UniProtKB/Swiss-Prot annotation, chain A:
Its job: Catalyzes the acyloin condensation reaction between C atoms 2 and 3 of pyruvate and glyceraldehyde 3-phosphate to yield 1-deoxy-D-xylulose-5-phosphate (DXP).
Key words, A-Z: Isoprene biosynthesis, Magnesium, Metal-binding, Thiamine biosynthesis, Thiamine pyrophosphate, Transferase
UniProt keyword Oxidoreductase, yes or no: no
Cofactor: Mg(2+); thiamine diphosphate
Binding note for cofactor: Binds 1 Mg(2+) ion per subunit.
One of the GO biological process terms: terpenoid biosynthetic process
Family label: Belongs to the transketolase family. DXPS subfamily.
Name of the protein this chain belongs to: 1-deoxy-D-xylulose-5-phosphate synthase
Recorded superkingdom: Bacteria
Residue numbers binding thiamine diphosphate: 67, 83-85, 116-117, 144, 238
GO molecular function, one term: thiamine binding
Length: 484, 470
């Protein structure tokens, strides 16, 4: 077909309108054959158009979803990766300023964003700074004017996204203004949380819930179903979600904010200045935590003064620490769970200082290593203790249910061992292992600590298999010696 | 003495227009004495239209609050939203929540997040925007009262009573030698030899000493107002344009841009230099920048090291850099005896002292660490004081020096949580170095013991108690 014959954007220039119709249908058959097709199917037409008007890469086309760039990838071979939502525009603004200062204003920067990217404060920040200049920036919006016109920008549209000639005409018209222009194109872990919250609320009416335009994935829809006046979808407004919960908490209520782990860095200043500064009882619930995105939640929350963070190991513990979080009314609290299914329960042998002991060194073995299991790494921590038992090394496996602040239990147990090893589903920089090491050195305890977790960069490659973690620990115990 | 007679806001409601003019005169004069003058009428109107206790009036900044008092930015909107909801759910929605805000808080993307959400409900939220010097609000679905003169006390009152009568979200619009100096001269001197250097502030160009930069280079100073998030990603854009962006961040506003530093700059390995002033409010920077993958952070000890490390950060072209310094009169220079592994050694153990304590001085605690080493000299304890110049990542030089000592004490103008002490501890433990480490610094709380003598006492203590285990 003609797709096989597309060597690059320049091969699209001399095509007929009928040939472009078959090329579009061929790309759609390709997109179906190699997989979000709606975005994809729309960008198919809009991209065939934006490559017949602009000369990529000399005219930088900056896609935002990273998904809409697929058809652009098939025609070029390149996307230009991940970034904060609604930032293509801010890349565009900065790129146009760079071109002016180096004498390359001849280059037209075009930002192709979806309707969902129009929301967000950064989008509002970028559109305000672009409108404040007569720098040439072309914002293409794929929908699936009054605002933009009052915003101080030219508006071109609405344009039917499936009429390639209509997009091409509007695009050439946008390349003409030499000024900013908008081209409008028309085209059971979680289940445990839900049940637990519902019951906690059937019993207390100070509980309410907030979500950043994702109650379905986060399992809050049910709360709205049973308590509709207590679920508050704030749309894509993490910064506003956190501070409304601060206001809701100043109103006598106890908010529960559900935000994905990787999307928490956005509301950080609102966690420090609005919730932690005033010691307000807000409960944050962090799904998509771990590699079971995220990787930094434990570190970021450890920076938050007076915070209490929990990482459930099983569904039963999820129900337990939720009620404990909802009963803290003098500061923020946090829960962290993975995005997989909840495995079988893991029973504890005893509770010392709030710390759950999940395994003890067998009779005849010494208290050699205290294995602090963080998040859902508890199953692997038991398997490491099962390998180290076969070698003669005695392991105490513990789940500090509340990771932050480091509980007195872990401190009491660490002095009774020769090596402390933390195992967290988080980045090692400033993570749970670091906080443990800091907490016992603050208590004049100098037991050697080792942090095992995700790297500080961007599962067998990571060494996070019970066989390799046992090797590492074996190499650590050997350098320490014998005794008790 | 009219201000002296106000017992409560309800005493204001019985005064006359001229009695009010008199109160306002006195309030302006008392402000002059305690030495905002534009919010006088606005505050007065609010008091005589809303009862402070029942009707929550929240200010975005502490400045407008002064007259309210006598009788973080753009966040008053989202507080007002949640407070109105809390009133709806608890059976007292008759309370009128008033969010009084100042101009510019409207450029901040956090405000548009709240404006979109207040305009989506019928909960009465009265947003009073105070312009210090119109259609967006109408198309946002928010009634707008009109350009109201702010020095007309009667005009503001008429507007507020009209907004309280609307029963829906409504906008009421009312028209009414040094650390930083040494940085400005160094940057301007570095920019005169390099075309690729640009600078970007967020409505703080003078407090950051980037104004002198704009007076020489007006084409290369960009102020985005309240837009830290966009200021960061737009700086990423300029770096993708083959340029080197120097952003001026105050430490307490780095939180708002943290996700943009992470994904837009660090992940893309773009050479953005993030200068941090007012550092040390500025007590969790070394902790957050430690989470940033590939970040190179420096803490100057003196003026000469601000110049030298700024130039080093400008020659880093494969990833972000950061320079953190305090705001005040830089002290005299402290030249090092020697530089080992990139680390400046400021003091060695005197003859007869042994290598017992490694004092890792960060930021401007180098004068204090030298005084501590002098005190510990009187007790027969030899101290090596070092300035890791580039604090993050922890260099091989501090690892090569930590092995020759019995105790390591990090001394940082930062919170003990995630700071330089925990980053040094985490680095030695990854290289299988178990030398005991102690972090003297700042309690992780929104707040002491940093007096040379207190630090010396705790260190003597640790040295007499080195080695604690099963």
């Amino acid at each position: 077909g003609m797709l096989q014959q597309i060597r690059g954007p320049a091969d699209l220039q001399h095509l007929s309108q009928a040939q472009l119709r078959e090329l579009a249908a061929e790309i759609r058959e390709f997109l179906i054959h190699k997989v979000h097709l709606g975005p994809n199917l729309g960008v198919v037409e809009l991209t065939l158009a934006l490559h017949r008007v602009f000369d990529s890469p000399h005219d930088p086309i900056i896609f935002d979803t990273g998904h809409q760039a697929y058809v652009h990838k098939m025609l070029t071979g390149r996307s230009q990766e991940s970034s904060h939502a609604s930032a293509a525009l801010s890349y565009a603004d900065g790129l146009a300023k760079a071109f002016e200062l180096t004498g390359h204003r001849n280059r037209h920067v075009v930002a192709v964003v979806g309707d969902g990217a129009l929301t967000g404060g950064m989008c509002w920040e970028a559109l305000n700074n672009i409108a404040a200049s007569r720098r040439p920036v072309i914002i293409v919006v794929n929908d699936n004017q009054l605002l933009f016109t009052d915003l101080g920008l030219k508006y071109v549209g609405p344009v039917d996204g499936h009429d390639e000639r209509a997009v091409e005409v509007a695009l050439r018209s946008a390349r003409r203004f030499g000024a900013p222009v908008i081209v409008h194109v028309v085209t059971g872990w979680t289940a445990t949380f839900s049940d637990a919250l519902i019951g906690y609320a059937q019993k207390r009416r100070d509980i309410v819930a907030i979500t950043a335009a994702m109650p379905g994935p986060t399992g809050l829809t049910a709360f709205g179903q049973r308590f509709p006046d207590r679920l508050f979808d704030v749309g894509i407004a993490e910064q506003h979600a956190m501070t409304s919960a601060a206001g809701l908490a100043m109103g006598g209520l106890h908010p529960v904010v559900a935000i994905y782990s990787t999307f928490l860095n956005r509301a950080f200043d609102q966690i420090m200045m609005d919730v932690a500064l005033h010691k307000l009882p807000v409960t944050m619930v962090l799904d998509r935590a771990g590699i079971t995105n995220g990787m930094w939640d434990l570190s970021m929350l450890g920076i938050v003064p007076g915070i209490r963070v929990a990482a459930p190991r099983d569904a039963t513990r999820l129900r337990e620490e939720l009620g404990e979080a909802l009963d803290v009314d003098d500061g923020p609290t946090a829960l962290r769970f993975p995005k997989g299914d909840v495995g079988e329960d893991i029973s504890a042998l005893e509770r010392r200082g709030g710390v759950d002991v999940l395994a003890a060194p067998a009779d005849g073995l010494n208290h050699d290593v205290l294995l602090v299991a963080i998040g859902a790494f508890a199953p692997m921590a038991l398997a490491v203790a099962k390998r180290l038992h076969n070698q003669g090394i005695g392991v105490t496996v513990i789940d500090p249910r509340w990771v932050l602040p480091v509980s007195d239990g872990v401190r009491e147990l660490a002095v009774q061992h020769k090596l402390l090893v933390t195992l967290e589903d988080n980045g090692v920089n400033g993570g749970a292992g670091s906080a443990v090491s800091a907490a016992l050195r603050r208590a004049e305890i100098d037991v050697p600590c080792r942090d095992v977790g995700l790297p500080q960069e961007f599962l067998a490659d990571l060494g996070l298999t019970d066989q390799d973690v046992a090797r590492r620990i074996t190499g650590w115990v050997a350098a320490l010696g014998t005794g008790v």
